[PDB]
């Protein structure tokens, strides 16, 4: 039949077990069953035994809230100091900071006293504030003599480092010998600009030179220019250890490097010339391609570690630099055919350079039988179809993510699989993805929301297959997505710029919350894309950037250029996900395409140069 368990539920959830305890030789077969076995334990979870709960874990580890109940349940056992138990069910993957300092303590009373230290060492460090049951284990610690002066100060720094100014300035109250130091470096973290007055931080010792490198490092994302004069002063001043001045010189040239100034050349070439970090290599070569210096680009993509080499950005690069270098060599077009065949954004640059179709290679999957019925017979598979007919997305998709946790990869492209045939297709997108299998391009880059897509596209003169990239890259088609600074639904829009298109284009908004609606996200996201589709003549590399980015930054990216090429100016983007995006967008736009049957090239004729002349 089917279950009336939401009285059991209702019942349960704030207040009493009788309609559970009644109904439960009815739902045994049930698969959501074991949501109100757990809600029923967890209410009367203080006077139950061991052996009711280690039997509930043995039975139902595999449920996503499992964690939450070992965390209340651990409490409980240090509290009861019932430590046997305790050890039995910690488990470091939980990622509990309140359990690991729990096992501190526990090491530290039992004779693991090295390894109590070790724990404690590795809980302290860090930038911000620990649970109470941490200063319980750093008392321990500090009564066993280990809180040395250059722990304490290490933390200072890292808290300085995290912005969280309470805990710095109170780890500043507990230094004896260092206290003037401590309170420079709060000040300073605050306001770096103030090593401008070299004399007041002339002191020649080790602890100066901390405060001082984090002033550094912290002006120059800020003001590299500053920075950039003062460290010829603060290096012969102050007792900067090798690695010291090499992270100061290592955020100055970065930073100097994404304002396209020169300057940061000579510094980048002397403090990493064996090419150890690959962002300062990456900038180096990304730098000389904005100056059009491409013999040098091109002498550095042949010196590039390994894991640059491998992939195909600096392999497109090493053939273009080439190509702009020696436009008479032949090398260019060989290096341009192996890359060709890739269905990724350089791979389709490659192909368009030759002047050949890209390759895009929809090979679908190719899944065993039993596997596929193993993953669908699953519990937490059935429990998760059980709640998408319900109605409950949320609780279906938690299952879905925390059963795939462990599953292999023949287990993934059959989870994939299954919720592509449920119409269901964020999941699909999500669990072909943790699999890696790359060439299925119907469940990769479904239709979700065509005629709605299509429909609002026409409206505003954009292609279809734009509109379809870019609601793919931003959500994946999960229409409640939220950002980490709340942007919104299926082409993540801000609250602020939602509010703004919903006046300025007369579409009608009812709540920030209300972006979940297809239809509202889609039709003043599509309004804003069109607005800033016309700010810069119908380019739709630099209103994708201007999309994701705003469009002050695009404009301040196209300062001073002239000729600009398009390939250069993307790979010269100063944010890492503003150029993926871009990069991603432009990608999806030519799979899109495809499947519409409205082929788009990677870029348009009147895209490939543009300036701000």
């Keep these: 039949q089917r279950r009336l368990y939401d009285q059991a539920k209702a019942a349960l959830a704030k207040g009493n077990s009788a309609p559970y305890m009644a109904s439960r030789s009815a739902l045994r077969d049930y698969p959501l069953e074991p949501y109100l076995a757990y809600d029923e334990l967890t209410h ?81 460090l860090v930038g911000k504030s620990q649970p109470a049951a941490c200063d319980t284990l750093f008392g321990l610690w500090q009564g066993e003599g280990q809180l040395t002066e250059e722990k304490v100060w290490k933390r200072l720094k890292l808290a300085a480092e995290a912005r969280n100014y309470s805990l710095a300035s109170h780890l500043a109250q507990r230094l004896p010998t260092l206290g003037n130091q401590g309170a420079l470096m709060v000040s300073v973290a605050q306001n770096p600009a103030q090593l401008s007055q070299t004399g007041r931080f002339s002191q020649r010792d080790h602890a100066t030179a901390d405060v001082v490198g984090l002033g550094l490092r912290r002006l120059a ?113 060989a290096l341009y055919q192996k890359l060709a065949g890739e269905r990724d954004f350089y791979g389709f640059l490659a192909a368009d350079r030759l002047s050949v179709p890209y390759k895009l290679g929809n090979r679908p999957a190719h899944i065993d039988p039993r596997v596929l019925q193993r993953v669908r017979n699953a519990a937490s598979t059935r429990r998760a179809m059980e709640f998408f007919n319900r109605g409950e997305v949320i609780n279906a998709r938690r299952e879905w993510y925390h059963a795939a946790r462990l599953f292999d990869r023949d287990e993934l492209i059959a989870q994939a699989r299954l919720a592509y045939d449920m119409q269901w297709y964020f999941p699909a997108i999500r669990s072909i993805s943790q699999a890696q299998y790359w060439d299925d391009l119907d469940i990769r880059f479904p239709m979700a929301h065509r005629a709605t897509l299509v429909r609002e596209a026409k409206n505003r003169g954009l292609h279809s297959s734009w509109i379809f990239a870019i609601t793919r890259q931003q959500s994946a088609f999960m229409s409640d997505a939220r950002s980490g600074v709340g942007a919104t639904g299926l082409m993540q829009l801000m609250p602020g710029t ?116």
């Design 498 to 613: 939602a509010k703004e298109t919903s006046r300025k284009f007369g579409i009608p908004l009812a709540s920030t919350q209300q972006l979940i609606v297809p239809d509202v996200n889609i039709r003043l996201g599509a309004a804003y894309l069109s607005q800033v589709h016309s700010q810069f003549n119908g380019n739709r590399v630099l209103a994708s950037a201007a999309y994701n980015a705003g469009p002050g930054r695009v404009r301040q990216w196209l300062k001073d250029t002239r000729h600009l090429a398009f390939d250069v100016w993307i790979e010269t983007i100063p944010f890492d996900e503003t150029r993926q995006y871009v990069q991603n967008v432009l990608s999806y736009a030519v799979i899109y395409g495809q499947k519409l049957n409205a082929p788009q090239p990677i870029v348009d004729w009147h895209e490939r140069y543009f300036d701000d002349f």
């Design 44 to 124: 009367r979870l203080k006077s139950a035994s061991n052996e009711e709960v280690e039997r509930f874990l043995t039975e139902h580890g595999d449920l996503p809230q499992i964690g939450w109940l070992k965390l209340r349940w651990l409490r409980l056992l240090a509290d009861r100091g019932d430590w046997k138990t305790f050890v039995n069910y910690y488990d470091p993957k939980l990622n509990f900071t309140e359990l690991d300092c729990l096992y501190g303590q526990y090491q530290l009373g039992h004779g693991q006293k090295a390894e109590g230290y070790a724990t404690s060492e590795r809980l302290w």
């Design 221 to 333: 994302r800020q003001d590299p220019e500053k920075a950039l004069s003062l460290l010829d002063y603060y290096s012969s001043a102050l007792p900067f250890s090798s690695d010291e001045k090499v992270a100061i010189a290592r955020e100055i040239g970065l930073s100097l490097a994404k304002r396209f100034d020169p300057r940061a050349l000579p510094l980048m070439t002397q403090y990493d010339p064996g090419l150890r970090d690959n962002t300062v290599t990456e900038w180096r070569t990304r730098l000389l391609l904005r100056l059009g210096r491409w013999d040098e680009a091109y002498a550095l993509t042949r010196k590039l570690p390994q894991d640059l080499a491998a992939t195909s950005r600096w392999r497109y690069w090493q053939a273009r630099s080439l190509q702009l270098a020696q436009p008479n060599s032949k090398e260019p077009i």
